[PDB]
Symmetry: D2
Subunit: 210 residues, 4 copies
């Protein structure tokens, strides 16, 4: 939208561009989803949104994304940044926070189209939102969590320098799933960062966050 | 979106086109809002949204339109149709229903940019959604409410054949306001209809309501 | 509770005492419900709560009553008054309002165990809360609604001087039901009232309502 | 209530009795609250309910307890057990769980009136619910969280054998507060349980949880 400055935000790395999904990018993301996100014998997500039928996925996705855009509040926000490789939407690296002005703590969530995995994009797009969070938002801590049987996202966290932060368990599609929690302080983030990241279009967004 | 068939719906009258607001149409509706919606000595809405600052109005509108788009369910839907006069979205004629397949009853809500009022677009645009509800959705009853000090929406209802359906009162900006309720039966709609209305691109949407 | 002054409110008529339901009264109420509330061929309630099994009904009722007691706010309250005959709970005459300090409008809901119907308790217990509403809370309007096939509550309303205030239709257990709405102004109440009503224990409650 | 079997549950230790709060016990808890729960320099609670005026405390507390009583569901429950010392309610040892049939994981919350602190009641009351969770409910994990500056609950956790399970930070009365997370497996519970515990009246409640 041309009426919400958050649409002008750009986070760029040597291979990726991240930005809030426009109407065009949402449709691209649905196209990517329909080509496949994960092997059907896995469930990497808290909410099993990828189980939805081919017919339902498109609107479920539009709905979720619309709701996330619409729910932005200074004290409770979620930013699902579309990840682009040469202008094409390959996945989402979200960043969110509750009471950010007070806590200075963000968490994240991610997915990539299946054919786009295993090329370092997941590490890079994480490095990208962390740069945004620490350098632009002046976050102090970033957290993430991964199911024990989701080693790609565990490795991404370990690569970006997160430390172990305890264990959780949740109901995952009717069965107990163990989860690992990760924590990244600004110190740790600095000591492990290797991706050159640039942010543009943020000046006008500053007062929305604080 | 090209992934939601409701975007293909068009309801046209001799002077108007109504459709679901796309990214661009939402921003056009916002441009119109920022030129003025109603006399400030007046509050024709139960939610005083037009009172928000020039700074807040654009996101508040997006948020709301997005929530409605995201919210479509067979048993609880709201269609916020953009009303186009030239190549500009001048207002919104909404149609909504809870448990529609059972009750077959719809209600409506409306607004037009200040510079567009008084040209008979209010009556024409109500006639358009009413034709859509009765003739395409197969509704049996349509309802509406107006504050007693909003004679233009009262006159639109009367011109379209609606009958008194009782009195209400609500809190409007911390003061009591009286409302008039209106009810249009399918048979009363036939009796009083004068506007030629055409519906296109609904065939693929049909299952969504049924 | 001895910690909430609304438990001291007493509304008394020649045959009835109405009061907020204590632990004991809630239990009497459930006893009464388990003996039966209406012929199974009928559904007089918006929410089909009497359809629940005999196993589930006791907790459904406690949960419901607990929630209404817990939910009291100045701008949003519901008073599920237990109706006592011979000192034992025979039913509930509820009074409720949203934005009462501004609208000064209340509505009501009621039910009696089967063996307690047709004695005029329903009329008398309506009279009881109408008096409390107008004389004690200074309401200006009371409303009520009945399914068209629920003549006993319709007749209680007509008897207390309410006037027809429109038609509605809802889903009721998977089928369409017509509802009649009723409206009583202060003056109409004062023209039709015949029951002697006394209110005790309200002085300390008064500030909770305005 | 005599219509909800959970009211028949008794968890007894050599000094304490825990049970769901009846109307009487809720009033005793409030009495205890009005005498004070913690040093006002401190905020041990994520929700600062002890900050309410003495005027609002009683209804806030009834409202909270009624909501927890009323909100019981197989997949989302909270048991706010009254803690009785010499037959009077002196605090609450809550036990709660979301999706328990699948996760087999519980969490807990506690408070005692000032004058009852420092006599081993907190340690013993935790053991009480832990034995109930592990021995009766067939839990596999129990969790707990304490703010860093809340050494009494930390100590209770350590004494009951919980292990460190990470860090969190939250907004606490407008300021950032660090919290510590504790985890206790069935095995570590077994290794460390000293307190003798009897559970009665659970026999009929069991199906409600499974
Ligand atoms: C999780 C991601 C985004 C990760 O992206 P990529 O596949 O691009 O990762 P990458 O940058 O190529 O690096 C992946 C790292 O995982 C390793 N790796 C991959 N699969 C492995 C396996 N089966 N066993 C062991 N290691 C494995 C690679 O060697 C590399 O480690 P080295 O650097 O050591 O060589 C993706 O795979 C995906 O979208 N998967 C499906 C959905 C999903 O799982 N979403 C995550 C939910 S959990 C979540 O949302 C929290 C995460 C967050 O905060 O964003
Ligand atoms: C309500 C509308 C959409 C009405 O449309 P217009 O202003 O285009 O009116 P119109 O089509 O030109 O004419 C319709 C009837 O209104 C009469 N009319 C117009 N302006 C009037 C006025 N100021 N005083 C008295 N009557 C007036 C015309 O003579 C005509 O009557 P004849 O046919 O006898 O010649 C608009 O006024 C508006 O947007 N106002 C600000 C927002 C608002 O009020 N929204 C509605 C809130 S209440 C609501 O949402 C429920 C309505 C619904 O269900 O859609
Ligand atoms: C509705 C009530 C509370 C009504 O109480 P009573 O039975 O004590 O009523 P009453 O004072 O004895 O007077 C009942 C009136 O019903 C008439 N009546 C009874 N059955 C009738 C029938 N089948 N056909 C025609 N008339 C009938 C009687 O002649 C009398 O009218 P005359 O004066 O002309 O002789 C109760 O019947 C009940 O609990 N019913 C089942 C649950 C229910 O329907 N709840 C109401 C939901 S609707 C609602 O909640 C809104 C009402 C409210 O605001 O509280
Ligand atoms: C937390 C409790 C229930 C703790 O119960 P008690 O007071 O009976 O404690 P206890 O069993 O007698 O053991 C207390 C032990 O705490 C330590 N201790 C107590 N106060 C301390 C202080 N100021 N500094 C350092 N240590 C301290 C000592 O080791 C002491 O053992 P010695 O006697 O050998 O010296 C209570 O203090 C309380 O209600 N406090 C106010 C509200 C509160 O903080 N609630 C908990 C919120 S956190 C939560 O709810 C999660 C915990 C849960 O799962 O229930």
């Amino acid at each position: 939208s041309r009426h919400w400055p958050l649409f002008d935000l750009r986070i760029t790395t040597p291979r990726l561009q991240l930005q809030l999904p426009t109407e065009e990018l949402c449709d691209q993301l649905i196209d990517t989803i329909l080509e496949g996100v994960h092997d059907p014998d896995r469930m990497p997500f808290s909410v099993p949104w990828t189980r939805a039928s081919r017919e339902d996925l498109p609107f479920n996705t539009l709905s979720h994304l619309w709701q996330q855009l619409a729910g932005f509040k200074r004290d409770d926000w979620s930013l699902p940044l579309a990840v682009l490789v040469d202008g094409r939407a390959v996945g989402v690296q979200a960043l969110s926070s509750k009471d950010f002005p007070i806590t200075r703590q963000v968490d994240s969530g991610s997915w990539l189209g299946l054919r786009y995995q295993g090329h370092g994009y997941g590490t890079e797009m994480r490095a990208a939102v962390l740069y945004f969070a620490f350098a632009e938002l002046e976050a102090q801590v970033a957290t993430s969590r991964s199911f024990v049987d989701n080693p790609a996202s565990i490795a991404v966290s370990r690569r970006n320098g997160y430390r172990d932060n305890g264990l959780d368990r949740v109901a995952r599609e009717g069965a107990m799933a163990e989860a690992l929690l990760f924590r990244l302080t600004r110190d740790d983030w600095q000591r492990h960062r290797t991706v050159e990241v640039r942010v543009d279009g943020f000046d006008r967004c500053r007062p929305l966050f604080g």
